[PDB]
From a paper:
Roseiflexus (R.) castenholzii is a chlorosome-less filamentous anoxygenic photosynthetic bacterium.
All three structures shared the same architecture, indicating that the Car composition and assembly are not affected by light intensities. Given the similarities between these three nRC-LH structures, we use the 2.8 Å model for following analyses of the nRC-LH structure. In combination with the B800 on the cytoplasmic side, the newly identified KγCext molecules blocked the proposed quinone channel between LHαβ subunits, forming a sealed LH ring conformation. The resolved [name] inserted into the LH opening in opposite orientation with that of LHαβ and c-TM, where these TM helices were stabilized by hydrophobic and weak hydrogen bonding interactions. This helix was assigned to cover the amino acid residues Ser12 to Asn58 of a hypothetical protein (WP_041331144.1) from [name] (strain DSM 13941/HLO8), we named it protein Z. This protein was verified with a sequence coverage of 19% by peptide mass fingerprinting (PMF) analyses of the blue-native PAGE of the nRC-LH.
Residue numbers in the entry:
A (entry chain C): 6 to 54
B (entry chain Z): 12 to 58
C (entry chain S), D (entry chain Q), E (entry chain U): 7 to 55
F (entry chain M): 335 to 640
G (entry chain Y): 1 to 32
H (entry chain R), I (entry chain P), J (entry chain T), K (entry chain A), L (entry chain V), M (entry chain J), ...: 4 to 41
N (entry chain 1): 7 to 41
R (entry chain L): 6 to 20, 29 to 315
Amino acid sequence: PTLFPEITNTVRGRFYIVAGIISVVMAVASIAIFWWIFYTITPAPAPPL
Amino acid sequence: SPWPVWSGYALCFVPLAAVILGFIIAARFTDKQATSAYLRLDPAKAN
Amino acid sequence: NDLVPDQWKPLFNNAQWLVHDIVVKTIYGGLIIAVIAHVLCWAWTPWIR
Amino acid sequence: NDLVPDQWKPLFNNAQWLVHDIVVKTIYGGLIIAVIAHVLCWAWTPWIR
Amino acid sequence: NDLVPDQWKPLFNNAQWLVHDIVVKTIYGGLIIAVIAHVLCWAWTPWIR
Amino acid sequence: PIDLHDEEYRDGLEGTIAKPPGHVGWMQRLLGEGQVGPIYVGLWGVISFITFFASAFIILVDYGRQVGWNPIIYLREFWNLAVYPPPTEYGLSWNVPWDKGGAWLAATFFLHISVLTWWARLYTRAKATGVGTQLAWGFASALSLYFVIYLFHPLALGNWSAAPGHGFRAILDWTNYVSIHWGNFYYNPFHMLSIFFLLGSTLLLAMHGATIVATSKWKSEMEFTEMMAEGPGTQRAQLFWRWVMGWNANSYNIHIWAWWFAAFTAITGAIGLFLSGTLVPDWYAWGETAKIVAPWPNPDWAQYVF
Amino acid sequence: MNWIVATFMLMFVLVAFLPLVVSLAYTWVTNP
Amino acid sequence: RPFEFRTSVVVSTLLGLVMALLIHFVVLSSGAFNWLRA
Amino acid sequence: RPFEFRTSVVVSTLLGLVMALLIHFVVLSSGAFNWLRA
Amino acid sequence: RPFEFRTSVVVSTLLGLVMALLIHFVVLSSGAFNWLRA
Amino acid sequence: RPFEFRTSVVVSTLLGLVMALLIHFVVLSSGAFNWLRA
Amino acid sequence: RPFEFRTSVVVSTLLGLVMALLIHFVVLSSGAFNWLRA
Amino acid sequence: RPFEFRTSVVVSTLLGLVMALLIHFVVLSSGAFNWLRA
Amino acid sequence: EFRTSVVVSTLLGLVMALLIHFVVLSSGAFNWLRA
Amino acid sequence: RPFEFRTSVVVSTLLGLVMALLIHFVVLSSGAFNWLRA
Amino acid sequence: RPFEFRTSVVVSTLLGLVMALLIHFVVLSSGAFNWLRA
Amino acid sequence: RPFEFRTSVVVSTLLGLVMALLIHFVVLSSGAFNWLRA
Amino acid sequence: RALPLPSGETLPAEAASAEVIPFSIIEEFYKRPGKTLAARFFGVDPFDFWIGRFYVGLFGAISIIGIILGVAFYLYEGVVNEGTLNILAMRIEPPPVSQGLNVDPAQPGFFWFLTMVAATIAFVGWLLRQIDISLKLDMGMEVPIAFGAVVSSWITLQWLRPIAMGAWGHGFPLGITHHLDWVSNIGYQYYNFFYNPFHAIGITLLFASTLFLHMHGSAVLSEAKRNISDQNIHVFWRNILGYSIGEIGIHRVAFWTGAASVLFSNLCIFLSGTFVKDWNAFWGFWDKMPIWNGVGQGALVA
Amino acid sequence: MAPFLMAFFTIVLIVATLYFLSMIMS
Amino acid sequence: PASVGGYQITCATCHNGKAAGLEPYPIEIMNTLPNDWRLPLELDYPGGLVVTGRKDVSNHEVEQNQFAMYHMNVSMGQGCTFCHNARYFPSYEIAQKNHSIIMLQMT
Ligand code: BCL
Ligand code: BCL
Ligand code: BCL
Ligand code: BCL
Ligand code: BCL
Ligand code: BCL
Ligand code: BCL
Ligand SMILES: CC(C)=CCC/C(C)=C/C=C/C(C)=C/C=C/C(C)=C/C=C/C=C(C)/C=C/C=C(C)/C=C/C1=C(C)C(=O)CCC1(C)C
Ligand SMILES: CC(C)=CCC/C(C)=C/C=C/C(C)=C/C=C/C(C)=C/C=C/C=C(C)/C=C/C=C(C)/C=C/C1=C(C)C(=O)CCC1(C)C
Ligand SMILES: CC(C)=CCC/C(C)=C/C=C/C(C)=C/C=C/C(C)=C/C=C/C=C(C)/C=C/C=C(C)/C=C/C1=C(C)C(=O)CCC1(C)C
Ligand SMILES: [Fe+3]
């Protein structure tokens, strides 16, 4: 039961859903894990004297 | 005293007026020429 | 254009006349509501003073 | 263009004459309202002083 | 357009009438919910004060 | 009466060189034409080339003198090296030492000859290949601005120091110094006109290029043919701009617009730069008397402070 | 927030670049 | 017909919406009413 | 016919709206009336 | 059809969504309610 | 012919003029002569 | 046949996703929930 | 016919209007007359 | 296209590796290259 | 025609004018002659 | 033929001239020799 | 054929020359060896 | 018959498939309703008509809402709220940096925020409407791409940079002659914006854009009304400069240089706000790149 | 309770994804 | 004024932890200035670096002025609008330009 048979039936189109999902989560994991590393290893800016 | 100087006027405002007016007139004549009838390829055929 | 009065037959289609009637009645209702809103806002805080 | 007076037949279509009549009556009503508004605003606060 | 009343037959298709009925009922339900939400937000914090 | 093969493949002076034309290949794929083609050497190109070479050689060996003849300090400071005009003292005099503006005067004179003979080359090759001389006159407007910058504004101010200093960083410094010296060039009204025409130049260039590349499938780019009879691509271009903004140009008008917007850039710029020193010493102060300066009683300066 | 938000906006500026790059690659690919 | 009815409807409705928004925003920013903490 | 009636209508209506807005804005900014908290 | 039902539906739904978003944002930015720490 | 006489004439004349100007410029800027108040 | 089911599905799904993203971003930026920092 | 009469009329009328405006503005800004509050 | 995904993933990984190395080296947290 | 007379005339006249201007400019700027109140 | 002989000659001669100039300038600027008052 | 021999020759020779110049510069600027009064 | 041409020349017909066709015919042949972006998404474009010469789409109506509201908000803040009455002296200022990113109807700078939001809606609607009209005419998407370059220049200045800085008072004021005060104060705060490399690239591409515009207008006007073989302009451009880019090449370069100028420009102002505070300090690395550190004496050392 | 809620919403995202992708991948 | 603070000059103000070898104008702050350049304390400072609309100076004096002004930019990291409204540099809007006049007289 589908309306996008060229997108949900055909292997090339069906694959595109997984491709888009995996690319979105890959980019999000990229950005999130970078900023996590950067903020955990970087020291706090030294307290003002 | 509320009045800009002659210099101010000449320089800014009559060039401002010229640019605005002249642009509008040039656009008027640009499109008179562009929308006039001249040799075009008939769209029904060429396309 | 049968439903249209012959005065407005040169201007209004058969379907355009019904939509015009809806628009006119909506404008009238909105006008009544706007008058009520203005009287209420004046009784509350006069803006002319 | 039968509804149009023959003086204005070179200028006004049959439909344009009715819309012109509406425009003229709207302009007249707006003028009366504008005169009333100006008299009220003058009685309230004269701007010429 | 048989399901449509004759008054609105010049305007509404047979399928457009059912979708219009859905839209009207949705607008009415949303209006009731909006009135309830406004009464609740007024009882909570009057915005007109 | 004009041989297109002879104008490309004659030999010697009043002929071309590099005559077996090379092909760049990536230029053909990206720009549609890759032939470097022969280049003309016509007794005005020769004057232009050798006078520009004299100018550049003077500048480069004075760069060398300034770094103590060190070819690494040369490469390190090349972009901040410059040959500055004579200082304000002894301002218009040409009896200036070579290091204090003596090299600048000679190099600038040879550059003047180079640009004038390049104009002559543009003119003579336009006449020789049968096209109009519109490019020579566009270059003449650019040269009006150029000769105000280097010759006519230093004169009428009384010092060569009013001119730029022949360097990668010196022209930026010159622009900064000239706007600072004469108040604020933002309130120079002919500077505002010239910016109007420069940003309108870029706007029309972008619009024109984009329109022709969009209607490229129907060969809108062949303007020479489209000016004889407008094909479907030019029709679509006209209709696009009519529907977008309510008016349009044809294959011919748009290039009039292009030429004149660029020429007005150069001309209004020349006028404003010449006015800044000689007639209106301060543009912001003039702008206050002109009522074009916005009052700023209590500015929020937290934005501009770190 | 400073560097995360700043780099997200930086990436939007580069995204703005992107369409023109697609145009150049389009010309190259479609002119073979 | 000088004016399509659809055109007049679109223009009038858009003008009315724009004017309602403009007047609401002018009145709210004026702080003259004490509406939404004014 | 020198002028289409639709053109004159559009021009007159737009001029009237622009002038009404301009005059309202000038009068409100003048502070001469004590309208909308002066 | 000058007045398609689909066209009226699209226009009304988009206008309602835009107006709901606009009014929510105006009310939230006004700080007049103490909603979401105000 | 391999060499055109007109080309050699143009090149030699331009080189001579450029060199005369350059040498005059260098000698005048040197201040070594007391020429034009040096 | 008006209103293809596919069209309504696309429009509703895209509207829901856009609204979920918008509301999440508004709530996270409000700092009432403090981007989850608490 | 060296000049179209319409061209000369347009040019002369525009020059006269521009010059009248310029002279009025120069005279009014000069403050030399006591016209419109000194 | 598989080539597109390969180019994008490889470039993202290289850029990420360089960025993380530079952030970690500049942090002066690990005792690497006299830090 | 290895050499056109018109070309030689143009080149010689332009060179003479440029040189006259340059020499006048150099002599004036030198201040070595008390011209126009030095 | 991988390489035109003229191309190799041009490249080698230009490289040699550039390198001779560079080395002369580096050696003269070093002041390590006492040549030309160094 | 993946690579014209002329291309590899040009690239390798230019890379070697650039690297020789770069390394010479780096070593001379380091002042770590008494080369050229260092 | 006289046979009038597109340039304006009347050529006497013997001394091609072309016929003298009225524009009205061209315009009515190419109407083709229902190909717009909105008609793909909703199945119909709500406004698929033309009001006069203008095409009114869904994004044309959004754009005109934005235009009217932006003009009216602009003129409210500056006639009222400022009292100026002259547009050269008015000052449409964002909220103060003190206020941060949040907007308040009671606080000043609220009508700048509304003018900016309505102007963004107007510009994005203009862009999407250009996409509409290019889709209607089966054209390429290049005009929307160039206008998107300049619209992203606007987005960077008023949305991306004020958000990244975090104060919403870092957007430029919308005043004639006064946004110049902001441009001057921002240009001098990060002193020598000339030394900003993306700014130098932007200026280079702006000057090159004007130069290419002049050269192209010259080239097409020079061959306009003459008996020419269409290869005369190519020979001219190979005699001068030894390269003729061709007809399709000059328009591609036009489009590309135009767009790239403002793209590098918005990269410049964004970096100027957020990552680089001083553009002279930026270039401090150059004299210390280790290949020329050591060689210098006196003032010739760095 | 924020870590609880973020974990909750990510797992609801994942389970939703398994469900409807299972249908699409049927 | 007291709005600046009541901070007073003391030893560490100029010495900063170094007894001898105190170097004003280090190579760090001479980035885009000429390395030989020094602050022109020769001039009478309430009006010594004034350049706008003068007509008896040209870009050489503007260049000297800009060297001094970028030295002030480095010395107080707050940049060029720290004491200028860049739309008119002759203006004393910001009131750090007056403090800077006092400080120029002091140095
Ligand atoms: C808290 C009180 C705030 C305020 C905050 C709001 C907020 C917040 C909103 C309004 C909205 C409205 N307010 Mg208000 N409002 C205030 C003061 C006023 C005053 C007055 C003079 O005081 C007036 C006249 C109004 C008038 C209005 C109307 C414009 C509108 C409500 C009826 C309407 O037409 O939409 C009726 C709405 C509907 C018919 C939509 C029905 C939609 C259906 C129910 C779907 C809803 C979405 C649903 C979750 C999706 C589920 C889909 C799943 C697939 C199943 N407000 C005060 C200041 N006002 C509401 C609005 O919609 O704006 C257009 C709204 O968003
Ligand atoms: C004052 C002494 C200065 C000095 C200042 C100058 C100056 C000044 C000049 C030279 C020039 C030259 N000097 Mg010297 N020169 C000095 C020291 C030297 C020394 C040496 C080691 O000491 C040497 C070898 C030279 C060598 C030279 C030659 C390169 C050249 C002269 C001959 C030549 O080839 O051109 C011979 C010139 C001609 C054949 C040109 C003939 C042109 C005809 C006569 C037209 C003249 C123009 C005329 C007015 C136009 C009239 C046209 C009207 C239409 C009728 N100089 C000292 C330092 N030297 C001259 C030169 O031309 O440089 C190229 C020159 O300009
Ligand atoms: C601004 C220009 C107006 C215009 C304004 C006038 C005016 C005004 C007149 C004419 C008149 C004439 N014009 Mg006409 N004319 C225009 C366009 C045209 C065109 C055109 C190309 O289409 C043409 C062909 C003409 C042709 C003519 C002839 C039909 C006729 C006789 C002129 C003559 O003999 O001059 C010979 C005479 C002179 C050249 C005298 C020169 C005068 C000088 C300036 C001295 C003036 C002394 C001054 C009055 C004293 C000053 C004292 C101060 C009070 C202190 N005009 C444009 C639109 N024309 C004249 C006319 O028809 O007579 C009824 C006339 O009165
Ligand atoms: C107050 C005295 C000021 C001064 C202020 C002005 C002002 C102010 C003006 C002039 C203008 C002029 N002055 Mg003056 N002028 C002064 C000193 C001088 C001296 C002198 C050496 O002293 C001279 C020679 C002049 C010379 C002149 C002429 C250039 C001109 C008047 C005649 C002319 O050609 O236009 C004659 C004008 C006409 C033929 C135009 C006729 C237009 C018709 C009548 C329509 C008028 C507009 C009308 C209202 C529109 C109604 C349309 C409705 C639809 C019905 N002035 C002193 C300093 N002078 C006038 C001018 O027009 O400049 C071009 C003008 O504007
Ligand atoms: C005041 C003394 C200054 C000085 C200032 C000048 C000035 C000033 C000039 C020269 C120029 C020249 N000087 Mg000198 N000159 C000085 C020292 C020298 C010395 C020397 C070693 O001391 C020498 C060799 C020269 C040599 C020369 C020649 C290059 C030239 C004069 C002859 C020539 O060829 O052009 C001969 C000129 C002609 C053949 C042109 C004839 C043009 C005709 C007559 C038209 C003239 C223009 C006319 C007004 C236009 C009317 C047109 C109307 C329509 C009717 N000068 C001292 C330092 N010298 C002159 C020159 O032309 O440079 C090229 C010149 O301009
Ligand atoms: C003073 C000692 C300085 C120094 C200063 C110089 C200078 C100065 C030069 C070199 C150059 C070279 N040095 Mg070293 N050199 C030094 C230390 C070194 C050391 C070492 C580790 O110590 C090495 C390995 C080298 C190595 C070299 C070679 C790269 C090169 C010499 C051979 C060569 O290939 O060109 C051989 C050159 C030729 C084959 C060219 C032949 C050209 C013919 C003879 C024409 C000559 C021009 C002629 C005048 C034109 C007349 C034309 C007329 C029409 C007739 N130098 C020390 C620091 N070195 C020379 C070089 O050419 O660099 C490329 C050079 O210029
Ligand atoms: C003094 C010691 C300095 C140092 C200074 C230099 C210098 C200086 C150089 C190198 C260069 C190199 N060094 Mg080291 N080097 C050092 C420490 C190291 C260390 C190490 C970890 O310690 C390593 C691994 C290296 C590694 C290397 C290689 C990259 C290279 C030498 C072989 C090569 O590939 O090119 C081999 C070179 C060739 C195959 C070129 C052959 C060219 C032919 C012989 C022509 C020569 C030019 C000739 C004069 C032209 C004559 C033409 C006439 C027409 C006839 N260096 C220390 C710090 N190193 C050399 C290099 O070339 O870099 C690429 C070089 O320039
Ligand atoms: C301090 C300062 C600076 C002061 C400045 C002082 C100055 C210079 C003032 C200048 C004032 C001027 C010039 C004012 C202008 C007033 C006008 C033009 C009003 C127009 C009214 C137009 C009107 C009523 C138009 C009505 C249009 C209508 C009714 C449309 C009608 C219709 C049309 C045409 C249709 O198809 C169908 C719909 C419908 C029937 C409604
Ligand atoms: C302080 C400030 C800023 C104050 C501002 C003061 C102002 C100016 C307020 C302005 C108010 C206005 C103008 C509000 C506008 C309200 C409207 C138009 C709501 C629309 C409702 C439309 C609605 C609910 C539409 C519902 C549509 C539905 C249910 C569609 C359903 C559907 C349709 C038909 C299909 O395909 C098939 C089935 C499906 C369900 C998918
Ligand atoms: C901070 C620090 C210190 C960093 C450094 C750390 C690093 C990264 C170092 C990097 C080292 C690398 C990458 C070195 C690379 C060296 C190369 C590529 C040398 C090339 C030689 C190529 C050579 C000899 C080419 C010779 C060419 C020849 C002989 C040409 C011959 C000829 C050609 C081709 C002809 O027509 C005809 C025949 C003829 C003989 C004339
Ligand atoms: Fe073109």
